[PDB]
């Protein structure tokens, strides 16, 4: 776990996909619970969390035509959160707003490369197939339940003044947080619960605890690099957590940032190991190895030359992996590193890749990227 000389901003740019692409800055959002009708891409099957970037490649003519249509209008499509991959259960979904588009005619076939970003969660009201093979879905835009401060109702008018704290200092953190708890939740003496009980539901305190548990994954985790909004912070954390699909569905269902943060803290404090899906006992790694090599956190989604989307989690150590192939810089998701296939030792199933730096001055020299779909969390 050496100091990261690497420019962590590199992978988030998806340079591997290609050169600059038509970038659309036209953010589009729908009003709360506003009923909408949006298209669906059968190619995509990943659980998209709002704020997470999804890269894609599409070659089938129907998909190319659909994305061409989407470039006009809003550029927003839907990603269904398949509870059961078979028969496309899809009881919840996320709107993805295309923000990067490129077109190429290599191989003699029309190919479109896209980068979308999750924008809003929604409930699926009706899923119907069209004559062109593009499913069109009814969308109830789920709202963001924003609650006031816990003590906002119970607050002495005299103490309302001075509720704004001076600042955070650039033991010191512990003392400042003790003072913050003492001053913010003073009027907790007017109620039947203690101050720490209200701290357990405080947005800022929960974000601070999550940051404390994240810092183990990134020593250079400067606060500015993480969102300050509770909603954005909660979604970022949910996107960066190495958890199964059911837990991701659960986190998507929650509409309140406080509840999402509490569930995220629960998950972080519980999950310990990462084991093979095609097995049930071969542990590939542990939470302690998770380290962030990107501004998007340890785990992020990338594409292959054939368009498949892999949610790769970056770690500084892996075990039980059989290595196949040779270090190839081609289409490497991490610039300046060469990749190689990795399989589970027992079942010989694909788990991820091992990345090796191409320059001796580059740290970390080696690391691993393990696909989320090829791992499951294991509790002790």
């Amino acid at each position: 776990p050496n100091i990261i000389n690497f420019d962590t901003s590199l992978p988030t740019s998806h340079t591997y996909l290609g050169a600059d692409m038509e970038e659309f800055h036209g953010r589009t959002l729908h009003d709360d619970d506003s009923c909408q009708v949006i298209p669906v891409l059968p190619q995509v099957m990943m659980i998209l969390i709002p704020g997470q970037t999804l890269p894609l490649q599409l070659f089938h003519p129907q998909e190319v035509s659909m994305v061409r249509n989407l470039i006009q209008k809003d550029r927003t499509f839907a990603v269904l959160a398949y509870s059961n991959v078979q028969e496309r259960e899809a009881q919840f979904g996320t709107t993805a707003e295309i923000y990067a588009y490129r077109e190429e005619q290599d191989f003699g076939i029309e190919i479109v490369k896209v980068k979308a970003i999750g924008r809003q969660r929604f409930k699926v009201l009706e899923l119907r197939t069209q004559s062109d093979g593009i499913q069109q879905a009814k969308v109830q835009i789920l709202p963001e339940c924003v609650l006031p401060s816990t003590m906002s109702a119970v607050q002495l008018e005299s103490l309302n003044k001075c509720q704004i704290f001076p600042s955070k200092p650039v033991q010191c953190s512990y003392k400042w947080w003790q003072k913050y708890q003492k001053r913010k939740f003073h009027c907790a003496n007017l109620t039947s619960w203690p101050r720490w009980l209200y701290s357990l539901y405080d947005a800022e305190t929960l974000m601070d605890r999550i940051k404390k548990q994240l810092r183990e994954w990134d020593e250079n985790l400067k606060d500015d690099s993480l969102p300050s909004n509770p909603i954005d912070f909660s979604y970022r954390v949910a996107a960066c957590l190495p958890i199964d699909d059911v837990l991701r569905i659960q986190l998507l269902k929650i509409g309140s940032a406080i509840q999402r943060l509490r569930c995220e803290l629960d998950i972080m404090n519980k999950c310990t190991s990462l084991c093979c899906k095609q097995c049930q006992e071969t542990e590939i790694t542990t939470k302690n190895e998770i380290f962030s090599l990107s501004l998007c956190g340890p785990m992020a989604a990338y594409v292959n030359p054939h368009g498949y989307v892999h949610e790769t989690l970056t770690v500084y150590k892996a075990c039980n992996l059989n290595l196949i192939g040779r270090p190839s810089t081609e289409h490497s998701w991490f610039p300046g590193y060469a990749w190689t296939v990795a399989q589970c030792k027992i079942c010989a199933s694909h788990i991820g890749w091992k990345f090796t730096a191409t320059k001796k001055d580059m740290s970390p020299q080696k690391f691993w990227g393990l696909t989320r779909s090829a791992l499951l969390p294991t509790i002790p």
Binding site: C145, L147, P148, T150, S152, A153, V154, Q155, L156, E157, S158, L159, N160, K161, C162, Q163, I164, P166, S167, Q171, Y174, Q178, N189, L190, T191, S192, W193, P194, W196, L197, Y198, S199, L200, Y201, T205, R209, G255, S256, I258, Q259
Partner: protein, 801 residues
């Protein structure tokens, strides 16, 4: 689908605002006090306070100012409510008839805007040229005080400083200048603006921007001939006026935050200040003539009063101290100190039952009429209050000088068990003052094998106090382990044991751990004047709540509900467990049904299965919102209190076709109470039309009562409410439906399933012609309803409390 009736057995007693002026007449010295929804107008006399009037407002008074625009012979009263109803009222007296006129009114809400961190601020220009309001960050609302602006039409002016901490209107300015202290990443600064009504905009302030103490909080607009302003913070008091700057850093004011103030002299030469620990100081402005200019600032510790929410100097050295945590006071400032060096001597004390954090109904005299024993107050103001209906509500006070948190009653031992907390400075800790836990007749300290610092650090010591029911003396005081926080308390029998025990749940709380990881369930027995620790159980979490469940113990440990049996060896054996994924803060029980509730309103309903020996999730209702209390009205209806001070009712409706509807608690009643309900308690205060009786205690010291009505009576009383709202003249012309509409924040829906008992009871206080107007084409049991039938119905309703 639910029918409930809510009455106020005791009106709110906490004071959140007081002003002095000439409201009733140009010659009278009036004191106006705001107690949440009540406005009390007294005439200050040499003999004390003479109550002149008391008015009920359809809102929580957030702002209350007196002003006398040119041409007026008396002060007008500007009032803003927590729902942003603004009104300018006048006092009119015709013979013996008193009525508060509504000179102007309106609603100053903005459809957009984040409510400010420091709450609503309301100020009036010294020349009464306008009213300045700070409700949302980045905006300053201006209401021109022109007599033609009868709708109080305001306009916003953008503020470049989002984090404004305080703001005032300056004196002696040709334009309505404002001086305000705000905060930004570079610290806290005092800045001045010059408001222009013609241009509806700010202009460059008179002096300049200036930097102030990092903890500057309070702004005082000194009158002429001084002018300028005084900024009061944690460690320093400074005076800014043009280029003139003055500062002092007295060490007396460094051990507590000064929160309230009041000008004593008309020329601003003296001010009263009050800290958070009940200390009352005097601030003196020494002036020297050159034009008069300030020479120095001196602060003196006048004395000690009840922890003051507001202060107001009436006359002849008399000061009214309005407090939220204790009884309000009328004290006198003496010229010379007494033998203990205190210049303050209390003349009168006005009862304040708030905050009510817990209560229990007990028939002490066993006459069939219950009495309500409440844990009221906080810190040195903490006490027990015994409230009983007289032959109108007699209240007895038992001071404790420490915070009482929970209370339960044990019939067999004829004593109350009270959980209490006292603050001790880590000196190794020492008590700040004598209190109930320290002066108990006999005492014990927890001694269990189970399980930095600073001089000024404060810690909480938690005690179980056994208090005699007759003398209310502290018979016993048992102190819990260090860092142990006592959260729950029940008194019950368990299993085949014929003894009655005090069972206490506690959590081991450390500042390092976010949530407790270990805790205790302790079983004491109070016998022959001794409190013996019968049993002790270690659990892996905080025991938030506990209830006797059909001879067993049902405890809530973190996010688990555990049922223990009381074996013959007198020890708790885990009978079963249930995992809910939410912290079971609220744990109520009725029959075999258990209601488990979380601070965010995540309610769920379990049923114990004796044959299977396990719990089953009967129903669930999760809805993000802050929740303060819950209760089980009957097998189906569950009553709770939630954010924006509103009651709600959930119904299970087990006779639902689809299993989805059998596992859903549909909300069937909403009602903006206007009070933050802290505790619910089954019981009644009258000797034993309506079914059931659930008293509830709130933060402002109000005690209310909720009962169940039949559909016919509910329909009749809803009709009566609609009839009355058209007849009764609300003060400030606030609509009753708007007042009682569910509120939250920018999300309001009409109240349903609740009959406003106070509005109905007011039917008896109107003139007979008004009664005839109210009763017209009404149907009563159908038949033609008459005034006397409704009088009889309302009289019957008035007897439940």
């Amino acid at each position: 689908m639910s029918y409930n009736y809510v009455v106020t057995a005791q009106k709110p007693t906490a004071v959140n605002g007081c002003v002095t002026g000439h409201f009733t007449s140009a010659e009278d010295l009036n004191l106006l006090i705001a107690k949440n929804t009540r406005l009390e107008i007294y005439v200050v006399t040499a003999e004390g306070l003479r109550p002149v009037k008391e008015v009920g407002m359809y809102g929580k008074i957030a702002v209350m100012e007196l002003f006398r625009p040119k041409g007026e012979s008396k002060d007008l009263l500007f009032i803003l409510t927590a729902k942003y109803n603004a009104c300018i009222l006048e006092y009119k007296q015709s013979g013996e008839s008193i009525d508060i006129i509504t000179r102007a009114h309106g609603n100053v809400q903005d459809r957009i805007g984040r409510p400010s961190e420091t709450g609503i601020i309301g100020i009036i220009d010294p020349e009464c040229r306008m009213i300045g309001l700070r409700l949302y960050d980045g905006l300053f609302k201006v209401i021109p005080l022109d007599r033609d602006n009868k709708e109080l039409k305001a306009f916003n002016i953008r503020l470049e400083e989002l984090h404004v901490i305080d703001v005032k209107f300056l004196y002696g300015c040709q334009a309505p200048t404002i001086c305000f202290v705000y905060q930004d990443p570079q610290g806290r600064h005092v800045k001045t603006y010059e408001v222009s009504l013609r241009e509806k905009e700010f202009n460059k302030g008179p002096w300049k921007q200036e930097n102030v103490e990092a903890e500057a909080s309070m702004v005082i607009a000194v009158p002429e001939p001084f002018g300028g302003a005084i900024i009061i913070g944690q460690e320093s008091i400074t005076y800014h006026n043009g280029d003139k700057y003055l500062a002092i850093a007295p060490p007396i004011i460094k051990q507590s935050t000064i929160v309230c103030h009041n000008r004593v002299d008309p020329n601003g030469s003296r001010y009263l200040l009050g800290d958070m620990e009940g200390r009352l100081f005097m601030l003196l402005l020494e002036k020297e003539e050159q034009t008069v200019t300030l020479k120095d600032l001196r602060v003196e510790l006048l004395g000690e009063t009840s922890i003051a929410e507001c202060l107001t100097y009436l006359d002849n050295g008399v000061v009214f101290v309005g407090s939220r945590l204790g009884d309000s006071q009328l004290v006198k400032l003496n010229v010379d100190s007494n033998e203990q060096g205190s210049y303050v001597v209390a003349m009168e004390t006005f009862t304040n039952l708030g905050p009510i954090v817990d209560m229990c109904v007990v028939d002490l005299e066993r006459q069939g009429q219950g009495q309500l024993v409440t844990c009221s107050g906080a810190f040195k103001e903490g006490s027990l209050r015994i409230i009983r209906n007289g032959i109108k509500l007699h209240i007895r006070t038992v001071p404790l000088y420490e915070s009482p948190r929970k209370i339960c009653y044990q019939e067999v031992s004829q004593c109350f068990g009270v959980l209490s907390s006292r603050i001790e400075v880590q000196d190794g800790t020492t008590a700040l003052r004598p209190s109930a836990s320290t002066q108990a007749l006999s005492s014990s300290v927890s001694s269990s094998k189970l399980f930095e610092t600073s001089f000024g650090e404060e810690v909480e010591v938690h005690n179980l106090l056994i208090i005699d029911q007759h003398t209310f003396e502290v018979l016993h005081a048992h102190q819990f382990l260090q860092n142990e926080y006592a959260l729950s308390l029940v008194s019950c029998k368990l299993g085949k044991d014929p003894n009655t025990y005090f069972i206490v749940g506690t959590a081991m709380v450390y500042p390092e751990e976010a949530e407790p990881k270990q805790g205790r369930i302790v079983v004491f027995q109070y016998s022959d004047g001794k409190l013996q620790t019968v049993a002790e159980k270690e659990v892996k979490g905080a025991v938030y709540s506990m209830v006797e469940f059909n001879g067993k113990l049902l405890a809530s440990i973190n996010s688990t509900v555990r049922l223990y049996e009381w074996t013959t060896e007198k020890e708790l054996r885990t009978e079963c467990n249930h995992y809910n994924n939410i912290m079971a803060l609220y744990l109520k029980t009725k029959g075999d049904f258990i209601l488990v509730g979380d601070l965010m309103r995540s309610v769920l309903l379990l049923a114990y299965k004796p044959m299977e020996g396990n719990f089953e999730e009967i129903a669930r209702d999760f809805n993000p919102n802050w929740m303060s209390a819950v209760e089980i009205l009957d097998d189906d209806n569950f009553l709770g209190a939630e954010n924006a001070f509103n009651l709600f009712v959930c119904q299970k409706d087990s006779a639902a076709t689809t299993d989805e509807e059998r596992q859903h608690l549909q909300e069937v009643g909403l009602f903006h109470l206007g009070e933050f309900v802290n505790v619910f308690c089954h019981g009644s205060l009258v000797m034993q039309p309506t079914q059931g009786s659930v008293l509830f205690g709130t933060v402002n010291g109000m005690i209310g009562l909720v009962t169940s009505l039949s559909e016919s009576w509910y329909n009749l009383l809803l009709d009566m409410q609609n009839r009355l709202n058209k007849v009764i003249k609300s003060v400030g012309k606030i609509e009753h439906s708007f007042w009682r509409s569910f509120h939250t924040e920018r999300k309001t829906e009409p109240a349903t399933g609740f009959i406003d008992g106070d509005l109905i009871e007011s039917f008896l206080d109107i003139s007979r012609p008004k009664m005839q107007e109210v009763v017209a084409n009404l149907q009563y049991d159908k038949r033609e309803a008459t005034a006397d039938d409704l009088i009889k119905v309302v009289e019957e309703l008035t007897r439940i409390h």
